[PDB]
Amino acid sequence: NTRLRIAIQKSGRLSKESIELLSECGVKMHIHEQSLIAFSTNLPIDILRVRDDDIPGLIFDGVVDLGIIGENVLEENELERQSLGENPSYKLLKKLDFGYCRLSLALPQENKFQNLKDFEGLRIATSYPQLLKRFMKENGINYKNCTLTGSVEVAPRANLADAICDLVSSGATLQANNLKEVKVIYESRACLIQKENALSKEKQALVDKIMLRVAGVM
Amino acid sequence: NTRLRIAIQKSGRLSKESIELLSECGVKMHIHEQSLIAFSTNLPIDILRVRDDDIPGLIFDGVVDLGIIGENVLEENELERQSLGENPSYKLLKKLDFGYCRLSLALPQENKFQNLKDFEGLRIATSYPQLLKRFMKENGINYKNCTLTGSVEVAPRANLADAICDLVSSGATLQANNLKEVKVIYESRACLIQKENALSKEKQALVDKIMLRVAGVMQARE
Numbered sequence A: 001n002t003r004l005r006i007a008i009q010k011s012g013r014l015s016k017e018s019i020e021l022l023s024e025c026g027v028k029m030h031i032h033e034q035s036l037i038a039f040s041t042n043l044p045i046d047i048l049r050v051r052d053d054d055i056p057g058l059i060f061d062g063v064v065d066l067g068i069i070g071e072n073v074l075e076e077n078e079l080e081r082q083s084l085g086e087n088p089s090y091k092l093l094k095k096l097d098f099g100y101c102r103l104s105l106a107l108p109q110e111n112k113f114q115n116l117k118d119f120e121g122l123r124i125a126t127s128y129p130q131l132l133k134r135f136m137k138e139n140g141i142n143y144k145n146c147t148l149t150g151s152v153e154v155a156p157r158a159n160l161a162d163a164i165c166d167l168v169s170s171g172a173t174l175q176a177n178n179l180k181e182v183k184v185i186y187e188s189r190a191c192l193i194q195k196e197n198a199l200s201k202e203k204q205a206l207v208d209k210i211m212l213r214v215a216g217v218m
Numbered sequence B: 001n002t003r004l005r006i007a008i009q010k011s012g013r014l015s016k017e018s019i020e021l022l023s024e025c026g027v028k029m030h031i032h033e034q035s036l037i038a039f040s041t042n043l044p045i046d047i048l049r050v051r052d053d054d055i056p057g058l059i060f061d062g063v064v065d066l067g068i069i070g071e072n073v074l075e076e077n078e079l080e081r082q083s084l085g086e087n088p089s090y091k092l093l094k095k096l097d098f099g100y101c102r103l104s105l106a107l108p109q110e111n112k113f114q115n116l117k118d119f120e121g122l123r124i125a126t127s128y129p130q131l132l133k134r135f136m137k138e139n140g141i142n143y144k145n146c147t148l149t150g151s152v153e154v155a156p157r158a159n160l161a162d163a164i165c166d167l168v169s170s171g172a173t174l175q176a177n178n179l180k181e182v183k184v185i186y187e188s189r190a191c192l193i194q195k196e197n198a199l200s201k202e203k204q205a206l207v208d209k210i211m212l213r214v215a216g217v218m219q220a221r222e
Ligand SMILES: O=P(O)(O)OC[C@H]1O[C@H](OP(=O)(O)OP(=O)(O)O)[C@H](O)[C@@H]1O
Pocket: A011, A012, A013, A014, A052, A166, A167, A168, A169, A170, A171, A172, A173, A174
């Protein structure tokens, strides 16, 4: 197999815009329900539709050639890999102009918040435990972890946590759960990344062509 | 919280059978299919319906009191936590009589397989990278990892991997993807576990009561 492998989010925040970037770069393909692999009809390119949390790993492990992924997800998994004693590596090709969001600490609307110190001792629910951990350590604040993959914003109401650390874009989900954003700990946007090890000449040439197109398209 | 917290899978292999064990143990429940939070109507017990991969962590971190989880999922996350330099700990209360499955290596049906050595150099897709890693190390076999959270079985036919390491229950998914099971690396069943730090006397008394009922239920279901 000589086909370039690009991993994108199967469904979620980045899916639509990732597909549109690719088509704007002249990559034609049909996306409809394929469980894992879609095939460009005009170029030797395979689009792997995966859970976003898997994309950093696929790139670090050299399973795919390119990936489109949020900085937050990339950094969370990079930190996890580094904490296991590994050396995750990737090339950053381009910071993209979509997927804008921020990872923030949030409290029940009725809670008094003067200072970050108010998070001392608190149980904090998040899907990004490594990012949360690094931030709290850097700011000298002790807390108790609660790792949930979904429904993080329900954790205070379920009495699993006193607070949360979660992605915010519109702020609608925090509002719906009667929570308030008190401290941004990370700002994110989508990026295009490549695996570390050199591609074949053919593949690198196609990547350079796509990057011109991305640069051009931008 | 005076209420005992039990974490169970929201939806998947163990969800139905975990809810049924609880009702079979006399725990009456109000559930909202889409919701994290469920509660017992006749006992001071909160049922937290979550992704199964989250349950070992909630127990290790003492966020909940009890959890029902597959041994496979528990072991994978225990290894992960230990590999991060942490000290995950839990009490095993009971091995349960549902959630039977095995984590196995599988290859395309048409592949020749003589020996485990045939995995040397191969890209192996899995949702259980620590369990795979430990097994391959202990058998002296080098491989390339591919971590996927879902659709693991399609990785070979998508040319993402040469092989997979995945749970097999009925074998139907492997058959559907024209893959064959060549080596079992772990046998698994659901288990009931408890966080490490001592419960209050009243909570521990409720747990002991539930455990008696669990035993009775299991004998009665044979
Ligand atoms: O501020 P809002 O616009 O209400 O958005 C907030 C939601 O978006 C995030 O999920 P997201 O879909 O980004 O994560 P995922 O795609 O990884 O599930 C986060 O988990 C919130 O639920």
